[PDB]
């Protein structure tokens, strides 16, 4: 999803289905990467 | 008018700051819940005096 | 069990005393609901 080398188009976009795994956001949040970084629903801390 | 009714929810998905904004919403109800209740029985205790 | 503590299941928080049920939920239904829609029983996801 975020480390994919080539994403759909935006036209066109592809929707990837997480379901029955461990997401671990923290490693995202402590590294930094994302340029802009936005949650509107709940808080960044909060997503584990 | 809050995201949800239940406290534990708001308080796992806000940030400390916005969830002082949703807080507030239930608690200004909750409040009116209460003076409607207590005015309704101050009413009604009248009549039963 | 038989004791007040603070329950994380299922990202469900809540403070309360944990005691064994009889009633008897349906292989689809998850969690239960009292007349006054607060929760009346959960399910422990790793141990049914």
């Known amino acids: ?48 | 008018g809050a995201i949800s009714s239940v406290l534990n929810d708001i308080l796992s998905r806000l940030d400390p700051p916005e969830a002082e904004v949703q807080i507030d919403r239930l608690i200004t109800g909750r409040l009116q819940s209460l003076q409607t209740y207590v005015t309704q029985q101050l009413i009604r205790a009248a009549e039963i005096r | 069990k038989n004791k007040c503590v603070n329950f994380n299941f299922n990202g469900l928080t809540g403070t309360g005393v944990l005691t064994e049920s009889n009633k008897k939920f349906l292989p689809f239904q998850q969690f239960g609901r009292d007349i006054a829609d607060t929760t009346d029983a959960v399910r422990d996801p790793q141990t049914l």
């Open chain 1, 1 to 48: 999803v975020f480390n994919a080398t080539r994403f759909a188009s935006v036209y066109a976009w592809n929707r990837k289905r997480i379901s029955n795994c461990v997401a671990d956001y923290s490693v995202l949040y402590n590294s930094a990467s994302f340029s802009t970084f936005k949650c509107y629903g709940v808080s960044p801390t909060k997503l584990n």
